[PDB]
Design an enzyme around this catalytic site. Structure first.
Site, mmCIF file in Angstrom:
data_model
loop_
_atom_site.group_PDB
_atom_site.id
_atom_site.type_symbol
_atom_site.label_atom_id
_atom_site.label_comp_id
_atom_site.label_asym_id
_atom_site.label_seq_id
_atom_site.Cartn_x
_atom_site.Cartn_y
_atom_site.Cartn_z
ATOM 1 N N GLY A 188 -40.618 22.312 18.529
ATOM 2 C CA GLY A 188 -40.240 22.905 19.791
ATOM 3 C C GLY A 188 -40.900 22.136 20.899
ATOM 4 N N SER A 210 -36.567 24.919 21.136
ATOM 5 C CA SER A 210 -37.398 25.452 20.088
ATOM 6 C C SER A 210 -36.860 24.880 18.831
ATOM 7 N N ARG A 211 -37.759 24.548 17.887
ATOM 8 C CA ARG A 211 -37.380 24.007 16.614
ATOM 9 C C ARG A 211 -38.106 24.823 15.593
ATOM 10 N N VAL A 212 -38.343 26.117 15.925
ATOM 11 C CA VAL A 212 -38.895 27.102 15.027
ATOM 12 C C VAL A 212 -38.055 28.344 15.227
ATOM 13 N N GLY A 213 -37.339 28.433 16.373
ATOM 14 C CA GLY A 213 -36.263 29.372 16.573
ATOM 15 C C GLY A 213 -36.653 30.823 16.550
#
Lengths: 187, 50, 144, 499, 468
Positions: D342, D366-369
């Site tokens: 993220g 975001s890359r954890v969402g």
């Protein structure tokens, strides 16, 4: 190979010399003669000062060696071949550097440690002996590793003493104790 | 309060130069000898205890 | 004081011991500091510039830096095969590759080794890798 | 008085020393004392000089060990005994750092008291494995609707905060801690986030304001403030995030959760540059060490949401990287961008446009969402993302004559933009996050004028509390939005729009 | 025994001085027994005086200088066997799946030479996949490197999983997912997903072997994770005959790791900072991926382009090595198409009229031309209206949107996750389907009823049942 490494720094000369002359078993002779020719070389004022100086050429240096080998002969010809090498390598100022190192290696082979009792005053003979005894009593001076303990007087240190040997020191000087005391009473 | 605190700091600095004076007293006397001797025997006591 | 390739203890020890340096350092070398596909050899005084040397490694190399009593070779070969203190022998010839007529129909690598394998080498001569190109007078008008 | 202090000070030099392995300075220049001795010497071992300064020994050279001084050269002088402390760098870990501003060593610079510590643990500790980790379900709430919904954040997660300084870079960070006060009140210690703020290269005057602000909002009691100031030496700065992380590991290990906010790792980089250059180790790209990447990777991969194997606890992290143009191209940003999962991209244009602190949330990712998002908050804020998405594109025709669809988007979008404005140090409960986004989604904000959005907000919330703080309490406690509750909510909002 | 005492620790470049005539060779593997278990140093130089310069594969913290070292004598020998399958294995060949000591019978050196001209691909053939889209629009080659582009969001990981299954059916192959510069979070996700989708079935069989190399792991070990993965693969190809497919993660982070070690080694950074030995190292890595007489390794790589600055040497060199690139798009997946492949971005050199035949080439060109024209058509379709454009033009567009839907096929691995049984479709039935679709025979069938299917025949049935 050498029983101990001084990690070179012109100790590489000393090392090479050490193993070569160790197998020639002529290190005590070499060292003494090296000291002896050095003492009278140093006490030749030209080329006891200018020997350190790098004024000399390659060719001029070689001619210096010829004078040096007139000053004494024999007593390990590997250190005589070293003289030639050192003139050729054009270093003759870090000649006594090598001498000091060679002495350490030589006396390391003999198994002898040199300690010091830096102090601010020349101490009692009782003190000298007691410290020498104490150091042998401690495992710090192990057996076969002899002790030359040299008390030195240094003005910079103001009172007390520091005993050093084995790269372990116990410094019970007044100067150091004073340093911490002063600091906390200024903080 | 401010000057009281300042005075307290000033006292430490006044006593700091007094510490220096007392250091000079150690270095002159044959406390200079007696306490160096004490360090010598103390060093012996530690070092034999090694 | 300063660093010299003769500060090396093995070099120094040979000199201190007054050991001779003929034909083992005039035509043979012993490897010293080696790594990064370049090797620094002591000796090889009869080495020609850009000669081909054959190492005891098996590796062959072309001298690049002809330095006073030292050579800095380039290894035509893996460092895996090379170890310190190997004996370097002069191949004796400037870097040449076989040249001839019957190389048609066969892959070779730079040395000349057929790397298609096919074609056991048939080459009339060998000729030095670096050749200075023909003169102005040697050239003549293009038309074909 | 002066005497009580004297007795303490003398007590503090009582008890004679007994030296062991020493080294002696040959020459000291540029914070690189070069010492002869120290035959045995652990790597990253602490050595204490006879000038009392401490150091680490990044170059162990063959016959001399090139110590790096953690302080001023004046203190050091030639031929100086350098005692070997014989302990790798370690810092206290324990609950005693809670409500304490400490220097790197661990000494309270606030002087609020000695650290209660159950260990001193070494600065660099290897990352927890694949199987020690577990999926992040727990969200962390900042009390900023946009961050919590648009950029949903969890606990364990490491996510970037790349933006320009003094736009309340520190303010954005501080806001989270305050909303975490709410959670802190919540008994469970996965809800007690014992936050750690790592102030790197920040002057004491500024950090004094920070400390006071934390205390003001009564949050400095589960906080830890690791302070490595602008003047504080580059070894301290370099190891400051590493040592700080080790504190974090203690919380994580205990199953508790905590949040460590490194501000700014860019100055950590700079300090390493000073060290490397002085150690003659080559400086990488932009004269910033190439294995600064290696450092960042080690540090940032200790942040983890553990599994029940190692107890489900976590160490949330939020590294802050300072940019001078938003130059993500720059070597230090590129590296950090890669490592983090993220990004939050805070932007100047928004600041001018009155969003202070200012975030460009189109360029935040975001890359954890939303796995680390409340189910409730997720439900009523999918819509919001899409409306805003259209709004960005349709902002590029906003400046006249426009199709009704485009114009409609603008109406909802302008109101939403105004609603998403936020001012420093205002956290907002989840039970009030959920209603506000719902209104915008249902386009109920459209009618109430842009200027009147501000008035709408406070009134709407109070109106919701009066009408049904039972409903609000249901949102909080159920944590889910039942269709009946959203039905009622929709009615409530309509009624509120009416008056 | 060959022993030496550590005589420097300047950085993580640890010089060990060994007693004379215990001569090492470059690329040796040293192991220092440590309270950290072991510290494994790899000899990358000889500094003379029987001293070395090494790189580290393990951490260097708390080192007391003068520690004794023992020399294995050569590149680390990494376990191989079918025991390695389904095990996450660290650089030092030790479990990071934590399923305990692998029973891998034999271990083999990691630094190794690339096959001879003979044992390199003399003619290339198309390794089959169940995905029709792959076998048409970017056919995979035997020995070939087809470097995936288009990150997770296109279902990259699931796509990769599908490939593992397909490879197993296709040849009998295995795979090894080697991850370079892994984010330890992502590694967790991958392991969990891989277990669940049964490419690693603990009780069952595990095709894929896992080697994960976190970013935190030192740059030397980051460089060597790739080579270790490759060694397993070559054991599969050479010593189990089996074709394998080796995924690599970022080869940018491979580059970064190599670049760092070069600077550590003292070697001058080449252009854009990238190592001077970039070409040769990649050269070795991508020439140990080829078709030997036995199997063939094939490698699908992930290229983290540096801000699409392809001009830079690290991407340029990477693209130089990659035979084909499959360019998955997130736009495509957003048109509901899984496969998420964008064929107007995906380009292969394996689409030739020899490699896949002239008929296939012509068919491919038509399908591509249809899509290209369709795309341009959609530009003006939105303003103009499709119905206002030519009968031929809307025929193309109509056929195209149906073709586009026909591309979509459920994935076998994620059959559980979607709830939709996947499709494994062979190359011959792929060719047949597009020919007929080009003649639009059964492409007179609605888009939704030409959506999410495998072969043409299957969707003849579905078309009817949907309507009924």
């Amino acid at each position: 190979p050498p029983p101990v490494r001084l990690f070179g720094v012109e100790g590489t000369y000393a090392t090479a010399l050490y193993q070569a002359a160790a197998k020639n078993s002529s290190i005590d002779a070499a060292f003494q003669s090296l000291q002896k020719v050095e003492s009278t070389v140093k006490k030749n004022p030209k080329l006891g000062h200018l020997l350190l100086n790098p004024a000399l050429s390659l060719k001029d240096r070689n001619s210096v060696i010829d004078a040096i080998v007139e000053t004494h002969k024999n007593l390990d010809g590997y250190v005589v071949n070293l003289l030639k090498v050192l003139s050729e390598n054009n270093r003759l100022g870090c000649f006594e550097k090598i001498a000091s190192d060679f002495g350490v290696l030589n006396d390391a082979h003999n198994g002898l440690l040199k300690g010091t009792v830096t102090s601010a005053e020349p101490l009692d003979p009782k003190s000298f002996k007691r410290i020498e005894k104490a150091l042998s009593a401690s495992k710090l001076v192990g057996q076969g590793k002899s002790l030359k303990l040299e008390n030195v007087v240094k003005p910079e240190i103001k009172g007390g003493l520091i005993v050093e040997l084995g790269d372990k020191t116990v410094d019970l000087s007044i100067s150091t104790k004073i340093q911490k005391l002063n600091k906390v009473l200024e903080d | 309060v401010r000057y009281e605190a300042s005075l307290r700091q000033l006292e430490q600095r006044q006593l700091a130069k007094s510490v220096i004076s007392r250091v000079q007293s150690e270095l002159g006397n044959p406390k200079f000898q007696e306490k160096v001797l004490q360090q010598s025997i103390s060093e012996i006591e530690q070092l034999l205890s090694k | 004081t300063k660093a010299q390739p003769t500060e090396v203890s093995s070099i120094l020890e040979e000199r201190i011991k007054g050991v001779s340096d003929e034909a083992n350092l005039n035509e043979t070398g012993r490897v010293l500091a080696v790594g990064d596909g370049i090797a620094r050899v002591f000796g090889l005084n009869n080495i020609q510039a850009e000669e081909l040397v054959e190492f005891s490694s098996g590796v062959k190399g072309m001298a690049l830096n002809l330095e006073p009593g030292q050579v800095g070779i380039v290894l035509f070969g893996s460092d895996r095969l090379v170890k310190e203190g190997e004996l370097v022998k002069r191949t004796g010839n400037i870097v040449d590759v076989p040249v001839g007529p019957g190389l048609l129909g066969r892959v070779v690598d730079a040395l000349g080794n057929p790397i298609d394998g096919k074609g056991p080498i048939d080459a009339a001569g060998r000729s030095r890798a670096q050749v200075k190109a023909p003169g102005i007078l040697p050239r003549r008008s293009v038309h074909e | 008085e002066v005497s009580s202090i004297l007795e303490e000070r003398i007590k503090g030099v009582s008890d004679e020393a007994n030296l062991n392995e020493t080294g002696r300075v040959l020459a000291v220049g540029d914070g690189i004392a070069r010492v002869f001795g120290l035959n045995n010497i652990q790597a990253e071992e602490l050595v204490e000089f006879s000038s009392g300064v401490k150091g680490m020994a990044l170059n162990l050279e063959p016959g001399q060990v090139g110590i790096v001084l953690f302080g001023s050269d004046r203190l050091v002088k030639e031929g100086e005994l350098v005692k070997r402390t014989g302990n790798i760098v370690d810092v206290p870990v324990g609950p005693g750092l809670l409500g304490r501003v400490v220097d790197a060593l661990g000494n309270p610079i606030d002087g609020k008291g000695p650290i209660d510590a159950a260990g001193r643990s070494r600065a660099q500790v290897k990352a927890p494995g694949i199987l020690p980790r577990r999926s992040v379900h727990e969200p962390v709430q900042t009390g900023l609707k946009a961050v919590d919904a648009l950029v949903p954040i969890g606990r364990g997660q490491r996510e970037l905060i790349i933006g320009d300084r003094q736009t309340g870079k520190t303010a954005v960070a501080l806001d989270t801690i305050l909303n975490q006060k709410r959670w802190n009140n919540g008994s469970d210690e996965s809800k007690k986030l014992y936050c750690v703020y790592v102030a790197v290269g920040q002057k004491r005057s500024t950090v004094a304001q920070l400390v006071q602000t934390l205390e003001q909002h009564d949050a400095m009691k589960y906080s830890i403030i690791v302070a490595a100031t602008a003047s504080e030496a580059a070894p301290l700065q370099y190891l400051a995030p590493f040592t700080a992380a080790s504190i974090g590991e203690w919380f994580r290990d205990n199953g508790k959760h905590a949040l460590i906010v490194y501000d700014d790792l860019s100055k950590q980089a700079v300090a390493y540059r000073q060290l490397s250059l002085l150690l003659r180790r080559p400086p990488g790209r932009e004269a910033y060490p190439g294995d600064v990447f290696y450092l960042h990777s080690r540090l940032l991969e200790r942040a983890a949401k553990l599994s029940e194997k190692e107890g489900s606890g976590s160490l949330t992290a939020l590294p802050v990287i300072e940019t001078q143009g938003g130059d993500v191209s720059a070597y230090i940003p590129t590296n950090v961008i890669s490592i983090t999962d993220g990004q939050i991209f805070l932007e100047a244009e928004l600041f001018y446009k009155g969003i202070r602190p200012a975030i460009n949330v189109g360029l935040s990712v975001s890359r954890v969402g939303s796995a680390a998002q409340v189910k409730a908050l997720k439900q009523v804020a999918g819509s919001l993302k899409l409306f805003l998405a259209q709004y960005r594109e349709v902002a590029a025709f906003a400046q006249s004559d426009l199709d009704a669809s485009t114009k409609q988007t603008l109406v909802r979008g302008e109101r939403l933009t105004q609603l998403l404005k936020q001012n420093q140090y205002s956290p907002l409960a989840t039970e009030e996050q959920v209603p506000l986004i719902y209104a915008g989604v249902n386009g109920h904000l459209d009618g109430i004028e842009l200027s009147r959005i501000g008035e709408f907000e406070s009134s709407f919330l109070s109106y919701l509390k009066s009408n049904h703080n039972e409903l609000l309490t249901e949102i909080r406690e159920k944590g889910e939005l039942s269709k009946e509750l959203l039905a009622s909510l929709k009615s409530a909002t309509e009624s509120f729009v009416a008056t | 025994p060959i022993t030496g005492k550590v005589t420097a620790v300047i950085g993580a470049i640890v010089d060990v001085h060994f007693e004379q005539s215990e001569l090492p060779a470059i690329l040796n593997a040293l192991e220092i027994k440590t309270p950290q278990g072991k510290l494994v140093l790899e000899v990358a130089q000889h500094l003379g005086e029987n001293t070395v310069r090494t790189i580290a594969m393990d951490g260097t913290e708390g080192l007391v200088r003068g520690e004794k070292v023992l020399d294995t004598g050569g590149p680390i020998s990494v376990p191989v066997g079918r025991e390695t399958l389904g095990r996450i294995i660290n650089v030092i060949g030790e479990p990071i799946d934590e399923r305990g000591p692998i029973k891998s019978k034999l271990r083999k050196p990691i630094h190794a030479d690339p096959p001879s001209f003979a044992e390199q691909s003399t003619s290339a053939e198309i390794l089959e996949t169940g995905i029709k889209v792959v076998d048409l629009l970017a056919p995979y080659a035997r020995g070939g490197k087809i470097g995936l582009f288009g990150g997770a969001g296109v279902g990259k990981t699931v796509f990769i999983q599908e490939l593992i299954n397909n490879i197993a059916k296709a040849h009998g192959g295995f795979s090894v997912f080697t991850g370079v510069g892994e984010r330890t979070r992502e590694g967790n996700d991958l392991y969990r997903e891989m277990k669940e989708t049964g490419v690693i079935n603990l009780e069952g069989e595990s095709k894929v072997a896992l080697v994960f190399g976190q970013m935190n792991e030192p740059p030397g070990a980051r460089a060597r994770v790739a080579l270790t993965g490759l060694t397993i693969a070559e054991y599969f190809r050479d010593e189990e005959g089996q074709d394998v497919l080796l995924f690599i993660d970022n080869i940018f982070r491979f580059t970064q790791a190599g670049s760092e070690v070069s600077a550590l080694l003292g070697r001058i950074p080449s252009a854009v900072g990238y190592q001077p030995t970039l070409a040769t190292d990649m050269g070795l890595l991508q020439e140990r991926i080829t078709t030997t007489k036995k199997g063939s390794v094939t490698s699908v790589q992930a290229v983290y382009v540096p801000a699409d600055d392809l001009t830079d040497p690290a991407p340029a060199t990477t693209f130089a090595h990659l035979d084909a690139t499959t360019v998955l798009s997130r736009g495509i997946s957003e048109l509901g198409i899984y496969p998420a492949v964008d064929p107007l971005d995906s380009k292969s050199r394996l689409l030739d009229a020899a490699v896949v035949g002239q008929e296939h080439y012509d068919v491919a060109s038509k399908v591509q031309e249809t899509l290209q024209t369709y795309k341009s058509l959609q530009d003006i379709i939105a303003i103009l209206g499709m119905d206002e454009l030519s009968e031929q033009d809307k025929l193309t567009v109509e056929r195209a949107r149906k073709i586009q839907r026909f591309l979509s096929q459920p994935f076998a691995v994620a059959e559980v996750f979607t709830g939709i049984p996947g499709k494994l479709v062979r190359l011959k039935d792929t060719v047949a389907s597009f020919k007929a679709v080009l003649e639009g025979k059964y492409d007179n069938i609605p888009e939704h009823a030409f959506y999410m299917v495998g072969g043409i025949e299957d969707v003849v049935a579905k078309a009817e049942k949907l309507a009924a």
